[PDB]
C-alpha cells in the first residue's frame, strides 16, 4: 500500500496548505497516516463538519490542485498574517486567497467558473470572522459580510460573526472552512460583499481504495 505519513501535519492542513505542510502539495496515498501530536501553525480556523471534509478527502486519495484564474476585481488579493509565517515574514494557506479591500472600497464580488472537464472538482473556500467591529470595517468596509457559494442546484450562504475568541497564535479572530464539489457540466459562482477567503482552484477527485488512519506506529 502507498503509505504517506503525515508527520507533523493532519490531512486537513496539508489540504489547506499550512506552510509546515506545503511539502504535501499534490501528494497521493492509499492510506494517509495521521500522528497523534500533529499540529497546525497557520491562521486559526475551524471546519464546520470537519469529519466529512477529512473523510471525503481521505477517500479522494489525492491533493492534486489545479489553479484556475479567478478574477477578483477591486479587492486586494493574497493576504497573509504573522500567525501563519511563510518563511520569516507573514504568510497564509497556500490554497486560499485572503481578499480584503483595495483603497477604501470592497465591491460586491460575483465571479463564476465552469466545470468543462470530465471530472468532479472540489473547491475549498472559507469566511473570516473578525474579532471586533473595527477590524470588520477596516478589512471589508461594509459592516456585515456574506459569502454565497453555489452550483446550479445547491447553495451555501455564510454570514460572518464578529467577536473575541481564545487567543491562538496571537489572533482572536477565525476562518471557517467550507467546500463545494462541482459536477462536470455544472458551474461554480461565488458572490460576496465581504469576508471571503477565496479559493484558488480545485482539487481533483478520485474514487479508489484510499483512506486515512490515526497512528503513532513507526513505518
Amino acid at each position, epitope marked *: 500500500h502507498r503509505i504517506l505519513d503525515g508527520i507533523d501535519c493532519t490531512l486537513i492542513d496539508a489540504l489547506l496548505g499550512d506552510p509546515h505542510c506545503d511539502v504535501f502539495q499534490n501528494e497521493t496515498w492509499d492510506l494517509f497516516v495521521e500522528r497523534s501530536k500533529a499540529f497546525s501553525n497557520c491562521y486559526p480556523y475551524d471546519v464546520p463538519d470537519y469529519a466529512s471534509l477529512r473523510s471525503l478527502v481521505a477517500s479522494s486519495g489525492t491533493l492534486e490542485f489545479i489553479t484556475e484564474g479567478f478574477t477578483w476585481t477591486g479587492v486586494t488579493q493574497n493576504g497573509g498574517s504573522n500567525a501563519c509565517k511563510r518563511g520569516p515574514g507573514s504568510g497564509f494557506f497556500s490554497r486560499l486567497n485572503w481578499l480584503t479591500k483595495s483603497g477604501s472600497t470592497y465591491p460586491v464580488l460575483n465571479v463564476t467558473m465552469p466545470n468543462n472537464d470530465n471530472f468532479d472538482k472540489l473547491y475549498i473556500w472559507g469566511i473570516h470572522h473578525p474579532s471586533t467591529n473595527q477590524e470588520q470595517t477596516s478589512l471589508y468596509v461594509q459592516a456585515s459580510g456574506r459569502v454565497t457559494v453555489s452550483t446550479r442546484r445547491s447553495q451555501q450562504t455564510i454570514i460572518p460573526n464578529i467577536g473575541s475568541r481564545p487567543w491562538v497564535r496571537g489572533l482572536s479572530s477565525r476562518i471557517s472552512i467550507y467546500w463545494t464539489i462541482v459536477k462536470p457540466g455544472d458551474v461554480l459562482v461565488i458572490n460576496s460583499n465581504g469576508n471571503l477567503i477565496a479559493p484558488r482552484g480545485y482539487f481533483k477527485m478520485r474514487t479508489g481504495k484510499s483512506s486515512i488512519m490515526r497512528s503513532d506506529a*513507526p513505518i
Partner: antibody
Amino acid sequence: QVQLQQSGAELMKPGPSVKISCKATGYSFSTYFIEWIRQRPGHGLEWIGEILPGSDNTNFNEKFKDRATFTADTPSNTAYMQLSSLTSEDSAVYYCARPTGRLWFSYWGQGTLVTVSA
Amino acid sequence: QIILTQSPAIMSASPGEKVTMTCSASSDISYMHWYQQKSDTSPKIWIYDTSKLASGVPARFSGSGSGTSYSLTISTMEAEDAATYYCHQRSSYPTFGGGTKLEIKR
C-alpha cells in the same frame, strides 16, 4: 510545536562519563528515531548513533560502539545518550535530532556543551 | 564510511554573485541533504533529497547531483546567506561534509 530540549552543558573529568538528555515534545516520541550528532571545534559534524524509542533499535557508528549508550524513556518523552571513558577528544557540542524519513521535517536540539577536563 | 569531501572550503562572494559548492561521496549515494549553519545555532535543513528546498529556504538556492558529485548553487548571494554549509549523506551510517564557509564581501 516540535521541540527537542537538551540538558545543560557539562564538565566531566577525563575517564568518566557524561549523560546528555533530550526531551521531545510536539510529535509522538515513539514514532521517529532520535539521532545524535556532535560538533568538535574545527572538525565538522560527527554522527554518533540513534534509537527508536519503544523498540530501542539502536544503530551506532562503529567508532562509538560500546562507548556510547542510547536509551529513551517514553513516559517522560526523553531520549538519553551516555558516553563513557572520556578524553579531551570528546569535548564538543552534542545535538539530538529528529530528521524523520523526510528531512523537510528535521529538527535539531539546541545543543549540549560537554567539556572534558580535570 | 561514505566520506563526503564537500570542499570549496571558504568562499568569498559579492551580492548577486552566483555561488556553487560541491560535495563528493567516497562510493555512491541517492540523495544529498544540505544543512546551513550560522554561528551559535543548530544546523537547519536547507536542501533535502538533493534538490528540494526546506520551508522558507529562499528560491535563490538549489541543489543537484546524482552519483558521487553533488552541489549546492546560489543564483545570487545575499548578505543573509553567509553561513556554513554542510552536506549530508544518509545512505548508511550517515555522514556530513566538512562544510564550506560562505563569506560575503562588502
